[PDB]
């Protein structure tokens, strides 16, 4: 078997990928999402009740389908990154990255020694298909994609430095934490926040990195796609489920 | 503690209850549904991957919310009915009921001896809250509601007889199995099927029993509510999740 | 490896075994109960929210401890009995046994062909420890113990017939279903019910079979032990947990 | 989406398919087995500790791989068959089939009304991918494959009658139950048993049905393949795990 | 929906709240404990085998009942605190707090930016009921309650400094870790230890914070209540289950 | 009850113990491995998809069998070590230990105050069998065994310093991470790497500590046993399963 090709990673340089946030934290819900045809599915280990084993179950469901999996761990924790890579997550979105130093450590956490600090356990891991991918330890690094989130004043204060870190493939901007960090908690729609988001996306793309964002607002999503944003999540499973059920009940109250 | 009051059962004689089909088979998804404000939630043990333990998890989630739980077991299996009552399901929807004899057996399956054949295990059961409901074995039968589904030619051929069974509180008509039994599999919208559904609802209400139905079609749902149908399910969680995600992706293809 | 000796089965003829009801339906709770020193633990598949997989987890917990496991399936279902024997349950308590014809079928359900109808699948089963017990298909039947419950008027109407079935090792009387069946639901304490229980125990022992019963009432339990009742369960984990927490809160209200 | 093509079913008429028994009852173990390259994987609901939900997880794992899933339910239970088809099992192996009448009922259990008695619930089912397979209710029957097991003297006494049942695609012979039924429990190797197996395979293929068998004995397996047996399982995951670990320890004792 | 009112937090200033430790690590066991009537239930993520998902299940169980949930995470880990607040835990008990600096970080961990460092993910969280609590991001901080444990000499050496931290609502003293830290491991009953506990409770209440403690000793528990201690846990589910089962067996040996 | 004797710990000074790696992450698979007769089983929390709850299930499975359990946590995390000791893991293998300062912290993490920093919670823990081991807080430390892994240049740079830490019972060398760290990723077989392994084993034994290693290569494993290596793991469950299934399929292609 040749290593699973990371089409998400390749597509960062060739197209704009449309994404769905997967927070229902369940192999069955992840499979329903995997049937729709999103370019990428964000399995949320930070804001949904997931652990290594529930994320594994969702990778297995989604694996039969074209949609590429991206895993957001709870934090840039090196051992947890080691766990998620070995279960076969090929793209990670690291929350709350605030310095070049922290971004380089995340690069190392995703690469085998001697170049990085990823723990070696290929015989045991879905990632190597238990060594059925015969050359895994030689070929793994090529198909790993590292994304970091900038979501604080300190991250924005270190944006140019993070953007010069080799091995950061993309910077994702989450309007929720960023709006809140800027003193507009719950109101990312403010001009002050939007101007900072647009400038940030411009700087990201100017430095040759992929820019990413989430917006459930169709107008803002299409605006971010007009700027060339490479990976745009356009909704959240929990929100779509809740709103579709509320909208239906309102027709009957 | 007094026994949990079955408001679904009481409401069969006082209003028209709007329902959501719960087939995501998960305590977390059941809780999202429980927040919307449906009158009733159908926990589907027949067509969703549920077992006694996953149904228990969904009863526990939903229990904090006003929405009344209805459990559809996989079949009119007496021991399985015993299990679902002891985990605290107070309303059951029995699929594929086709005779007075089978309907009376389902009544007995829901009532303690000597009047019925429900196995006695109150010390162990969430239903008695492990005997924290001190009078449970005296008061349980009052708050149990039995619904049966008519979904075959044989059931329609035995409708008058089922409708004279004391302890059948309601007859639910599932257009899917009924359309299929009538040779219009996948097309319940045919006039031949709809005329049979309307006549069936009329006969059900004429015999003093509650009529129920499911339709994701808003026009048919409101038509069934205009006829006085007592319990109408207006959608399905799996369908709302899939369609909301497909509709959103179509705005971006 | 030699097959696990069924000490419960042997002790039916040499001593009186003290039992605890396990309805907390969980490997971790079953292990707590396993530490106490009960002669037997009844893993309740009829009145607690258990399936084959949760019962297997409880057998694995308990296996490190001297306490012998007895499993009560939801009903005398031949395929379910097959499942529970293959996960390694060596003693079964069959609910709701009402005829010699039904007792004989339960005997066959527990014995391999050609003498019985137990499905053969030893390579796969914990019961054979996946063929690490090399002679399992030759030795299995010797260490299987079959108990049946008489809990209905019809059972009591067929008691002499059930007691002449070879391979029924014991008859358990559950006062809850029996009291209910006799029109004293929730009050097994009545003289009418108790006289029937005592006579029933006497007839069971007179026919050379083991008698069993459950009572959380210390006085009744010691009374049943004075009659020579071979297997006596003296409490229920769910009840002890609830009562201990209630008594404790009462000291501080 | 078009319905998943049942390649196992097609190959019954075009090649000889090599199978692995999957009784580790686990999505993770099922995925390891799925990477090997077996033509078919037998998810054992009869002799391994599986339920609908654990079988769903194993289907989801295996779905990303070419290996075709075959599910053996605990028994020819019509409601359980309904449940396994809806989670998306396209091939079923029914244990303990003993008459044409029982085989015909299993055929109907797998087909929608009006031809069959399969309960209709496509909106909810992974089988229809929650109606993302738009024609599912029209196209589903064509990709369903029904195998039955003959494992008793009564089955052998009804073999010609079972073989004339339209819609039985295959008869599988399990030497374990059959050897036991013939009074050679745990010694299927006996000439008396093997002559019966060979004759049975010849009769099955003579009637234009697929023959199937399991043998962990390489010689017997290759013999059955020389007879033209269409589906041959050649080992069992539990057995290969235990034996591989025992062989390794023996090199070091 | 308005945000769940944190009655535990309000009662810290108006009454003395009686608590039960919940370490059976199970939604079913948590629900049994929830029926008793304790003012608060301590879901122990530090000393019972719990993770985010098992704590969520226990929150869902308990939610239908008046008893207030308090969650003890394994350590003052900011990302884990983020995870427990989002699943909807409104009161946290932080183990092993030893400095004002650490207590201030725990305060911030529980509050949204710009005041605190709690990660923003309201669309996904049971805490916001998936934004069905429409003002959640504005109202969430008011219903969050932060308790810290002082259980080391260093903590006692920093007690006045921890007590001056705005946003620490309560200091809990666990005699087990504190007795051990003082060189009396497993004998918190010693006068040297008790004088320290009494003095500590007096200092905590003198600084206008709530004092808390656990003791299974009724006399010590009632003594701590006579001192005005605001939250007193009076037993542990694991201990009451084991002891109740041991006491019962001893009546029969 | 007396505390469980750690035979693994005792045997470090009296014999050479043969080990199997358990990465199938499942109570049912851990029990199959437990039947074989390995001296020790390594429950891998670093490279297999395990959490505290799945490790507890595997400890419960294995506990019925003579094989001693060793747990490898994901990292030398003090709170996680606390969790794993409380579920009853008596031998820990700490990955990625690189200094005497880190080894000493791991020693303290495994010992109660005042000598160590292990959090006290014996009422709640399987480790004390919920205080059924009456003297647990006095006797626990004697039966705890601490192993550390040297797997980096920095570890080898600190080997003499780590080897002088009292309370480090053993140093395990994992050829995978070490080979990788040395610039021979995936080829531990190189003379440069092997010479370092042999010298390392010699230095470990010269300092009075137990040496450990894993090799699936029979020749290397016997070589390590001839040097007197005290604990040698000779295979990996995931690898044996995959290889046994691959070899078997190869006979029939
Ligand atoms: Ca978990
Ligand atoms: Ca289950």
Numbering used by the authors:
A (entry chain A), B (entry chain A), C (entry chain C), D (entry chain B), E (entry chain B), F (entry chain C): 1 to 253
What does the publication say?
Ca2+ ion was found abundantly in purified AbHpaI. However, it does not act as a cofactor to enhance enzyme catalysis. Therefore, the function of Ca2+ ion in AbHpaI was further investigated by analyzing the enzyme structure in complex with Ca2+. Therefore, Ca2+ functions to prevent repulsive forces and to reduce movement of the (β/α)2 loop in AbHpaI where Asp51 sits. Consequently, by stabilizing the (β/α)2 loop where the active residues Glu46 and His47 reside (see proposed mechanisms), Ca2+ could indirectly aid in the catalysis of AbHpaI. Apart from the catalytic Zn2+, our structural data demonstrates that Ca2+ is found at the trimer center on the dimerization interface of the AbHpaI hexamer, neutralizing the negative charges of three Asp51 carboxylate side chains, which is unique for AbHpaI and is not found in EcHpaI, SwHpaI, other pyruvate-specific Class II metal aldolases. The results showed that apo-AbHpaI is quite thermostable naturally with a protein melting temperature (Tm) value as high as 81.3 °C. The binding of transition M2+, but not alkaline earth M2+, can further increase the thermostability of apo-AbHpaI.
Here, we investigated a new Class II metal aldolase from the p-hydroxyphenylacetate degradation pathway in Acinetobacter baumannii, 4-hydroxy-2-keto-heptane-1,7-dioate aldolase (AbHpaI), which has various properties suitable for biocatalysis, including stereoselectivity/stereospecificity, broad aldehyde utilization, thermostability, and solvent tolerance. For Class II metal aldolases, the enzyme uses a divalent metal ion (M2+) as a cofactor for substrate binding and stabilization of an enolate intermediate, which allows the reaction to proceed through C-C bond formation or cleavage. Each protomer contains eight β/α motifs of a TIM barrel fold with an additional α-helix (residues 6–11; N-helix) at the N-terminus. Three protomers are associated in a tight trimeric structure to generate three catalytic pockets, and the trimer is dimerized to form a stable and rigid hexamer with 35% buried area.
